[PDB]
Every structure is written in structure tokens, then in C-alpha cells.
Amino acid sequence: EVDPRLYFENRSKFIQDQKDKGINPYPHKFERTISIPEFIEKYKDLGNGEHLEDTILNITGRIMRVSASGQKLRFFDLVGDGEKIQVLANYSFHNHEKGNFAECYDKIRRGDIVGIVGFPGKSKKGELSIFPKETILLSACLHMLPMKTEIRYRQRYLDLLINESSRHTFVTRTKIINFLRNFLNERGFFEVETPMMNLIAGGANARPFITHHNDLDLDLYLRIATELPLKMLIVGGIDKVYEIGKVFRNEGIDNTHNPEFTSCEFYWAYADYNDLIKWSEDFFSQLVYHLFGTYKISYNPIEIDFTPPYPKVSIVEEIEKVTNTILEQPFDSNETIEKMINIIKEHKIELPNPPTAAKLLDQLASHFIENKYNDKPFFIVEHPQIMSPLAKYHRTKPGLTERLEMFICGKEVLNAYTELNDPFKQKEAFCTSLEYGLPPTGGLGLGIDRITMFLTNKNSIKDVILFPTMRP
Amino acid sequence: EVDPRLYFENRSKFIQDQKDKGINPYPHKFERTISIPEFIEKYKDLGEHLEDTILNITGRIMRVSASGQKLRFFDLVGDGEKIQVLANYSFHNHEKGNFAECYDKIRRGDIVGIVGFPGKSLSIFPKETILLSACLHMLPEIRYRQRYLDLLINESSRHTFVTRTKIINFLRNFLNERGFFEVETPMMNLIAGGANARPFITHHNDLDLDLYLRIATELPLKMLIVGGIDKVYEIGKVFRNEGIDNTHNPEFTSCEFYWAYADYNDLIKWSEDFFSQLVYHLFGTYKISYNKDGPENQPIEIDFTPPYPKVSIVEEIEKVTNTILEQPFDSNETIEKMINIIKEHKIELPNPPTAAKLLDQLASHFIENKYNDKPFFIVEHPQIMSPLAKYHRTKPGLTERLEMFICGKEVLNAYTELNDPFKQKECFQLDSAFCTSLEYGLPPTGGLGLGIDRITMFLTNKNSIKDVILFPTMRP
Numbered sequence: 032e033v034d035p036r037l038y039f040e041n042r043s044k045f046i047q048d049q050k051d052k053g054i055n056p057y058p059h060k061f062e063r064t065i066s067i068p069e070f071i072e073k074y075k076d077l078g079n080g081e082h083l084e085d086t087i088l089n090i091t092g093r094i095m096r097v098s099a100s101g102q103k104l105r106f107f108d109l110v111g112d113g114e115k116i117q118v119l120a121n122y123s124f125h126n127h128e129k130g131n132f133a134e135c136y137d138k139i140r141r142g143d144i145v146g147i148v149g150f151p152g153k154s155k156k157g158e159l160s161i162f163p164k165e166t167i168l169l170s171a172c173l174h175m176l177p178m179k180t181e182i183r184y185r186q187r188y189l190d191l192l193i194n195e196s197s198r199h200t201f202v203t204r205t206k207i208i209n210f211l212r213n214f215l216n217e218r219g220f221f222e223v224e225t226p227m228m229n230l231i232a233g234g235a236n237a238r239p240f241i242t243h244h245n246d247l248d249l250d251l252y253l254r255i256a257t258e259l260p261l262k263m264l265i266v267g268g269i270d271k272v273y274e275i276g277k278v279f280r281n282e283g284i285d286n287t288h289n290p291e292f293t294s295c296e297f298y299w300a301y302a303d304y305n306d307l308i309k310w311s312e313d314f315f316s317q318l319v320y321h322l323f324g325t326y327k328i329s330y331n332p333i334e335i336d337f338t339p340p341y342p343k344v345s346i347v348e349e350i351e352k353v354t355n356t357i358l359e360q361p362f363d364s365n366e367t368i369e370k371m372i373n374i375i376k377e378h379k380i381e382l383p384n385p386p387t388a389a390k391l392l393d394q395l396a397s398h399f400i401e402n403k404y405n406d407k408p409f410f411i412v413e414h415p416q417i418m419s420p421l422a423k424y425h426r427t428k429p430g431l432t433e434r435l436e437m438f439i440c441g442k443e444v445l446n447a448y449t450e451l452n453d454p455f456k457q458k459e460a461f462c463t464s465l466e467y468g469l470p471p472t473g474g475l476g477l478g479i480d481r482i483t484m485f486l487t488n489k490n491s492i493k494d495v496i497l498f499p500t501m502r503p
Numbered sequence: 504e505v506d507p508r509l510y511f512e513n514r515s516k517f518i519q520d521q522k523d524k525g526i527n528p529y530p531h532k533f534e535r536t537i538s539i540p541e542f543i544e545k546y547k548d549l550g551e552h553l554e555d556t557i558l559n560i561t562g563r564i565m566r567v568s569a570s571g572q573k574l575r576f577f578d579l580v581g582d583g584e585k586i587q588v589l590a591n592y593s594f595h596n597h598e599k600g601n602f603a604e605c606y607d608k609i610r611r612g613d614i615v616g617i618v619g620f621p622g623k624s625l626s627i628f629p630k631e632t633i634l635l636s637a638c639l640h641m642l643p644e645i646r647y648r649q650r651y652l653d654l655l656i657n658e659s660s661r662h663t664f665v666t667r668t669k670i671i672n673f674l675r676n677f678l679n680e681r682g683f684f685e686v687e688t689p690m691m692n693l694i695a696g697g698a699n700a701r702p703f704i705t706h707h708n709d710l711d712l713d714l715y716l717r718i719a720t721e722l723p724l725k726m727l728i729v730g731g732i733d734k735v736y737e738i739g740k741v742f743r744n745e746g747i748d749n750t751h752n753p754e755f756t757s758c759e760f761y762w763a764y765a766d767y768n769d770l771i772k773w774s775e776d777f778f779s780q781l782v783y784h785l786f787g788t789y790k791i792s793y794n795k796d797g798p799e800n801q802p803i804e805i806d807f808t809p810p811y812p813k814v815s816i817v818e819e820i821e822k823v824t825n826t827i828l829e830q831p832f833d834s835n836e837t838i839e840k841m842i843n844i845i846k847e848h849k850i851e852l853p854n855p856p857t858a859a860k861l862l863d864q865l866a867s868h869f870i871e872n873k874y875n876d877k878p879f880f881i882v883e884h885p886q887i888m889s890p891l892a893k894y895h896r897t898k899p900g901l902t903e904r905l906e907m908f909i910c911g912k913e914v915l916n917a918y919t920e921l922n923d924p925f926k927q928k929e930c931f932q933l934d935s936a937f938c939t940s941l942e943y944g945l946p947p948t949g950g951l952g953l954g955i956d957r958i959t960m961f962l963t964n965k966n967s968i969k970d971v972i973l974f975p976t977m978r979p
């Protein structure tokens with residue numbers, strides 16, 4: 032046992048003493064000639080007890096175990112890029128003209144970043160190793176590191192160094208985003224950037240963040256979505272367009288909500304809801320196979336089968352069906368509002384404030400549909416116009432829209448529709464752009480963080496964001 | 504020849520009349536079988552007709568002409584390309600509507616679907632033409648507020664934003680080929696560091712908390728180096744709550760990377776490789792022309808062939824002003840001296856006149872416009888300007904820093920990172936989370952920032968940042 036403060040204070044005095052004796056504990060440059068992954072790839076085939084003594088290399092990394100088998104034989108584990116080798120430092124092999132062996136190695140502690148000049152071999156036990164001639168401290172770790180709560184979210188660097196799975200999680204994340212980018216680019220889509228701060232915040236229903244620009248003396252809204260300006264680009268003649276990036280919604284933090292999250296929205300001119308469904312099934316099934324070489328995955332446990340096609344459940348037909356009720360249109364008539372309210376009560380669930388037709392329908396949809404399936408993803412489709420102000424009216428079903436929303440394990444990860452392009456039907460900047468002619472178009476949104484949760488077996492969004500937002 | 508409101512209001516009545524006569528003017532779906540680029544590629548080689556092929560094609564009408572009632576000529580555009588629609592009474596399927604009625608209805612800007620056959624006279628010959636989405640206004644500062652108009656009317660506008668995405672694509676593949684790992688860091692933090700700039704503030708309601716939009720990505724990326732991600736980067740927006748002018752937009756796109764075990768010399772090689780390769784990739788040459796002073800007056804050449812000149816900020820200021828600037832730079836004798844030089848040359852005195860801002864001002868007057876024919880680096884900036892850069896390995900008072908300039912504008916800032924936590928407190932309000940991460944061991948590291956919008960300005964021949972942002976931030 033050691034007191035952390037003593038540890039820290041002592042390592043601090045050590046640093047100052049090195050400085051004072053003229054040794055620079057933070058040297059500027061150490062020219063490494065090979066990485067640890069490279070080193071392993073290149074020498075893993077060596078024979079037990081075989082040294083290549085005439086092959087000198089410079090290698091770096093973080094010391095993670097310190098050991099000894101006497102004062103003239105020190106062992107360390109050295110990690111870089113998520114791989115590990117042994118450092119076997121033997122007194123006889125040490126270049127004594129550069130410091131007392133014992134001084135130079137007593138000072139090396141767990142967490143230290145080091146540079147090593149030495150030669151590759153395997154120990155007789157077969158352990159792939161570097162045998163120093165010289166070991167340089169490049170950057171000390173001044174605190175004792177954990178061997179094994181909230182710290183993983185506040186000190187993500189600690190998490191990344193100690194837990195192999197943490198690194199796997201964020202690697203998978205970037206892979207997911209890479210796949211998506213190439214998937215859209217293969218299909219002729221054009222990546223763009225739209226503003227994060229606008230005079231209005233539209234394209235979804237969510238409270239916004241507000242901020243103030245000093246030069247223009249103006250209160251701007253951080254964006255809750257990217258829909259409106261992307262559509263303006265369709266009008267502008269960019270027929271396949273998308274954006275991957277953050278959006279901001281000013282509401283509660285939970286296991287599936289972070290106030291900044293990463294979305295992808297695309298707009299596809301001359302497509303419609305049917306094209307969007309096909310796209311969703313292709314994307315998800317191909318994404319999953321690309322990561323796992325199979326369509327069925329384990330999640331915390333339950334199997335999720337991503338083999339297309341997926342079930343499509345019509346929001347009205349299904350609510351009515353599981354509640355032996357008819358919901359007469361208009362959906363915001365008093366008779367249908369009262370009725371919807373009755374169901375809420377009849378089933379003792381939380382009444383939304385205020386109880387508008389759109390929010391009641393939404394609430395009924397979360398209770399009676401959204402957890403219909405767990406074995407596969409599925410779509411809820413054909414949402415009422417009152418919920419869907421920017422979706423186009425259904426081509427055979429008055430009151431409804433050509434909309435879909437994909438769910439995985441009761442959580443929405445996708446929202447898409449045929450875009451309303453008739454400016455007259457919309458009144459009930461962007462609006463001006465519609466008057467110039469928005470071609471028939473299909474639009475689609477993904478929630479990236481939520482997708483990554485499922486494909487890395489996490490059940491908090493916090494586990495797939497490097498630095499999630501938290502109370503200090 | 505027409506009032507815009509009449510035009511608009513009339514096209515509106517037309518839309519309603521179509522609806523009332525049972526025609527849906529905004530059909531849900533027209534299944535096209537070929538795009539315009541595809542169409543061109545496939546039939547460029549056809550003076551002849553091929554009635555041996557019936558196709559469905561879409562696009563926006565952009566010119567309407569005629570040579571008789573029975574002979575109508577349109578330009579149709581999609582994905583940057585254009586073909587002719589030659590609509591001839593002969594070829595029209597009269598079992599689907601009066602030829603003259605249909606085609607009198609079609610105006611400039613209309614989005615249409617066409618069923619016809621390919622030929623040259625390079626054209627599509629309709630048997631039938633469907634309206635898919637009308638343009639209710641006659642088509643021609645507006646370029647910034649209605650960027651859709653700009654994208655449709657000016658070929659160069661589309662070139663500009665295509666080039667922009669290409670630039671970002673090249674950069675992404677350039678870092679990925681070299682083993683770099685893309686990540687996302689937060690846009691809203693409890694403090695905003697990594698640069699000197701006023702921040703935007705916003706408030707989260709459920710946690711009842713004030714947060715700062717990020718002015719840079721430096722600190723959290725460095726925390727990822729500590730975490731063992733030795734090559735890391737982020738491309739994305741940052742926010743600085745400052746003035747707006749030809750080279751400043753309050754949100755702009757940057758790229759920052761951190762390269763463990765590299766230093767300032769690695770960063771210079773990287774900069775030269777990146778820029779020269781980027782330019783050749785776009786133009787098949789290293790020398791490009793740029794209308795600094797506007798398309799009105801004469802352009803200049805910019806030669807991106809490496810290597811680029813490196814000018815040491817202290818050496819050069821002293822040299823062009825016959826002065827010695829004794830360290831410390833924030834002593835009174837050296838502040839007063841710097842002031843007197845600003846006074847003797849009638850340049851604007853910064854408020855307050857700190858050592859760092861005076862040095863900065865002297866650097867913008869006497870160095871930053873040294874070259875115009877090539878990019879160049881200003882290097883080895885004083886510590887007082889550079890609170891996160893590491894101290895120079897042989898030059899007291901200075902740091903291992905570089906800034907690249909193109910035509911007098913900074914596009915790159917990079918350095919060997921200060922990784923000694925004891926020296927940093929002394930340099931520094933900035934993060935304790937960050938400061939704590941340093942104590943766990945930041946390896947020797949090189950960091951670099953690019954200003955993407957400003958790079959794109961130079962490589963698309965624009966001299967306002969507003970020309971390379973789709974929707975720049977403006978007053979209503």
C-alpha cells in the first residue's frame with residue numbers, strides 16, 4: 032500500500048531533482064523505428080531463446096507491469112496501440128556508460144512512457160521481447176494507475192488504457208461511421224456541411240439550446256436537425272446529399288439520450304418511402320455482416336436477427352387492434368382526443384402535458400407498439416399528418432403520411448419519409464426554397480450513437496461517446 | 504417582362520387548377536431509368552434517332568425556346584450536366600393530352616419527368632412530358648441567402664463546393680492511409696480551451712448548467728493521446744465568438760491531429776507533403792493562380808512545390824526594425840520598446856498592450872505578407888504567445904512552433920506539444936480535467952491544426968470565406 036498523495040508528491044520531487052541534476056525528464060524527441068504492432072508482426076515467428084543481437088531498434092510505449100527476478104534482471108510489459116510485448120532488461124546488456132543500471136531502472140514505474148534502444152528476441156519461455164541497451168523515460172505517470180464506475184466517463188484516458196473492450200468499442204464506432212460514409216459515397220451521395228446555428232431551429236420536435244453572437248448582437252439556436260438546409264440543397268440541384276454530424280437537443284440525459292449526439296441525414300431526389308425501406312434493410316444487414324460476418328448478434332442476453340426483410344407495423348392499424356378501439360379522423364377532434372385519453376387512463380399510464388393529439392398518439396405508440404419485437408428490427412409506418420408536418424401525405428390514405436421509423440430493442444434509430452414538396456400543403460427561407468421547386472425526394476435520419484450501442488453490446492449511450500456530458 | 508408577384512400568384516392558380524382538373528402537380532413518384540450524366544456517357548456517340556429505345560429521365564428545365572408551335576426546345580439539367588429536350592409534335596403521344604396545352608404549361612425552373620427516346624440533330628425526344636415540381640418564381644447577396652439559386656445558375660458555384668468536399672475527402676484519406684484514427688469530441692464543455700478566443704455560451708436545462716461551445720479540439724484530443732490512441736484526429740466545426748469579415752466566420756471547420764512521438768520537424772514535412780499533394784491532386788500541378796485583389800484586377804501565381812520558406816518570428820522582426828528585444832518579452836523595457844515601434848510606424852495599438860498581443864501585431868505588419876508567390880512558415884514563436892507549445896530544445900524563451908501562411912492569411916498552426924505538467928500550470932482559465940490528464944503521462948507528441956474554409960478559399964479562387972460555406976451566418 033502507498034498513499035496516492037505521497038506517491039504523487041514523491042514523483043513530483045523526483046521530476047524536479049532530475050531537472051536539477053541536468054537530466055531532462057521530458058525529452059523532445061525519441062526517433063522510434065518501429066511500432067509495437069509492427070514489432071509483433073515481424074518477430075512473432077522467432078524461436079524460443081533466439082536473440083537477433085545485431086539488429087538494433089528504437090521502440091516506445093507505456094510500461095504497464097513492473098517485475099523483477101533479481102536486481103540485474105527486470106521485466107516490464109510495454110503497450111502501444113492496444114498490443115503488448117515484454118521488456119527484458121538484463122544488467123549485462125545495458126550500456127553502462129550512460130547511467131548506473133540500478134538507478135536508471137529503479138526510477139521506472141507503472142504508467143511511465145519510455146523509449147527503448149535494444150534488440151528483439153524471445154526468452155527461453157518463448158516470450159517475445161525487446162532487450163534494452165538503453166531505456167529512456169519520456170514522460171512519467173505521476174499517479175498510481177488503477178488495476179480495475181463514473182471514472183470511466185470522467186477520465187476516459189484511464190478507461191482506454193486499462194480495459195481492452197473500451198478500445199474495441201470506439202474502434203467499432205469509427206468503423207461504423209466509415210462504413211456509412213463509403214456506403215453513401217458508393218451510391219453517388221455528396222457530403223456537405225450545414226450550419227450549426229440558425230435563426231430558427233426546425234426539422235424536428237425538440238427544445239433547442241440558445242446562444243448569443245456578439246458582433247451581430249443576436250440570439251441563435253443550435254440545430255436540432257439538418258433536414259431543412261439539406262432540402263434546400265436538393266432544390267439547388269444536388270440530388271443525393273448527406274451530412275454526418277452533431278445535433279443538439281435540450282432535454283433530459285438518460286441511458287439513450289445525450290444532449291449532443293451524432294446523426295446522419297440524407298436526401299435522395301426521385302426516391303420515395305419504398306426506396307428508403309429497401310435502403311434501410313440493405314444498409315443495416317450489410318453493416319452488421321461487415322462487422323461480424325453474420326446477421327444475428329448477441330446483446331445484453333438476446334439474439335437480434337438483422338436478416339432482411341423486417342416487419343412493418345402501421346401505427347394506426349396496430350394501436351386500434353391492440354385496444355379494440357376505432358380512432359376517427361380528424362385525430363385532433365375532441366371525440367378522438369377524449370378517446371385516446373380514455374385509453375391512457377384505462378391502462379394507467381402517464382398523461383402528457385398538454386394532451387395534444389400528436390403527443391397522445393406518440394404516448395400510445397410507445398406503450399403498445401415500440402416493444403412489439405425484440406428478435407429483429409422493425410418499422411413503424413404511416414404516421415398521421417399531425418405527427419409529421421414535413422412528411423408527404425400518403426398516396427392512398429388520407430390523414431396519413433409516407434413515413435417510417437426503425438426500432439431496435441424498443442429504441443428508435445431511424446426516421447425517414449417521402450418529403451412534402453408542395454409549398455401550399457406546408458404553410459400549416461426554407462419555405463421560400465419550396466416555391467422554387469423541390470423535386471419528389473426521400474429523406475432519412477439515423478441515430479449513430481444508438482446504432483453503435485447495439486453493435487458494441489452497451490446499454491448506455493455514455494459507453495459509446497468518448498466524453499459524455501455530465502454534472503461536474 | 505412580368506411582375507414577380509403576378510408570376511408567382513398565377514403559377515399558384517395554375518397549380519390549384521391542375522389539382523381541380525384532377526391532375527396531381529406534385530406526383531409522388533416517377534421511376535427514372537437513367538440519369539443525365541449516364542445518358543450523356545451512353546449516347547454522346549450516336550446526327551441520328553434511336554426509336555429502338557424508350558427511357559424515363561428527369562431534371563430541371565433551364566431554357567425554353569421554340570421554332571414554331573410544333574417544335575419546342577428546352578435545356579434539361581441534372582447533376583451538373585445538361586441535354587436538349589427537342590419536343591416535336593410528330594413524336595407526341597396525342598392519346599395523352601394536347602401537345603400545345605402541355606408544353607405551354609412548362610416554364611423555366613420546372614422539374615419534369617420525360618418519356619422519350621435519345622437522338623442528336625444531343626437530345627431526348629419526348630413522347631410524354633410530366634410536371635413533377637413547379638418553379639413558382641421566375642429564376643434570375645442573394646447568392647448567400649438563397650444558395651440554391653446560386654447552385655443552379657452559376658457553374659462555378661457547384662465547382663466550388665464539389666472542390667470543397669474533395670478537399671475534405673483527400674484530407675480524410677491522407678490521415679487514414681497514415682494510420683490516424685478519427686474520433687468525435689464534445690462540442691459543449693465546462694470550459695473552452697485550446698486557443699485564444701471568446702466563446703459562445705448556452706445552457707442545459709435538465710442539469711441546470713452553463714456550457715461553452717468549443718473554440719478548438721486540442722485539449723480532448725491530447726487526452727486521447729494519454730489514453731493510448733497514438734494517432735488521432737477530428738474534422739469538424741469550432742465556434743469563436745468574434746467578428747465577421749472576409750476571412751472570419753464564427754462557425755468554421757477545422758481539422759486537428761495529434762501524432763505521438765513526432766515533433767515540429769515531422770509536422771513541417773507533413774505540411775509540405777499534404778499541401779503539394781493536395782494541390783496536384785486537384786490541378787495536376789503545384790502552381791495555381793489566384794485573384795487576391797478580385798476578378799476585376801490581375802491575378803497572382805502561388806507555387807506549392809516544397810520546400811517552403813521558414814521565417815523565425817524573433818529573428819525577422821528584430822532584423823527589419825534594427826532592434827533587439829530583450830527577454831523576458833513581457834518586461835517593461837521590451838513592452839515599451841515594442842510599443843514605440845508600433846508608434847513610430849503608425850500601426851493600431853492593441854488593447855490591452857500585452858507582450859503577446861504586441862508581438863502578434865508586429866508579426867502581422869512586418870512578416871505575414873513577406874511572400875505571395877508561395878506558402879511559407881513563421882516559426883519558433885516565443886513562449887508568451889504559445890502557452891501549450893513545448894519549449895524549444897536549444898532556444899531559450901522560444902517554442903517548437905510553426906504557422907503556415909497563404910497570401911498573408913494563417914491556414915495552419917502546429918507544434919511540439921508541451922507535456923510537462925509542471926511547466927503548464929506556469930503557462931496557466933483552462934481545464935483541470937486536462938491538467939489532470941497531463942499528470943498521467945502525455946508522451947512526446949506533435950499537434951497540428953488546419954483551417955479548412957480558408958484552404959478552400961485559395962484553391963477555388965475566392966476571397967471571401969462566405970463563398971465556400973454553403974450557408975454563411977448573416978443578419979436577417
Ligand SMILES: C[C@@H]1CCC[C@@H](C[C@H]2Cc3cc(O)cc(O)c3C(=O)O2)O1
Binds near residue numbers: 282289294295481
Ligand atoms: C436524428 C435521429 C434520427 C433517428 C431518430 C432519432 C434518434 C435520436 C433521438 C435522440 C434524442 C435525444 O434528445 C438525444 C439522443 O442522444 C438521441 C439519440 O441518440 O437518437 O433522431
Ligand SMILES: C[C@@H]1CCC[C@@H](C[C@H]2Cc3cc(O)cc(O)c3C(=O)O2)O1
Binds near residue numbers: 750751754755913915
Ligand atoms: C484552427 C485553425 C488553425 C489555423 C489557424 C486558424 C485559422 C482559422 C482562424 C479563424 C478564426 C475565426 O474566429 C474564424 C475563422 O473563420 C477562422 C478561420 O477560418 O481560420 O485556426
Ligand SMILES: N[C@@H](CCCC[NH3+])C(=O)O
Binds near residue numbers: 257258474475
Ligand atoms: N430531421 C429528422 C430526420 C429525417 C426525417 C426524414 N426527413 C429527425 O431529426 O428525426
Ligand SMILES: N[C@@H](CCCC[NH3+])C(=O)O
Binds near residue numbers: 698721759891950
Ligand atoms: N488548437 C490550435 C490548433 C493547433 C493545435 C496544436 N497543438 C488552434 O486552435 O489554433
Ligand SMILES: [Cl-]
Binds near residue numbers: 426
Ligand atoms: Cl405505396
Ligand SMILES: [Cl-]
Binds near residue numbers: 443
Ligand atoms: Cl426517444
Ligand SMILES: [Cl-]
Binds near residue numbers: 063763764765
Ligand atoms: Cl511515428
Ligand SMILES: [Cl-]
Binds near residue numbers: 768896
Ligand atoms: Cl531541431
Ligand SMILES: [Cl-]
Binds near residue numbers: 913
Ligand atoms: Cl486570423
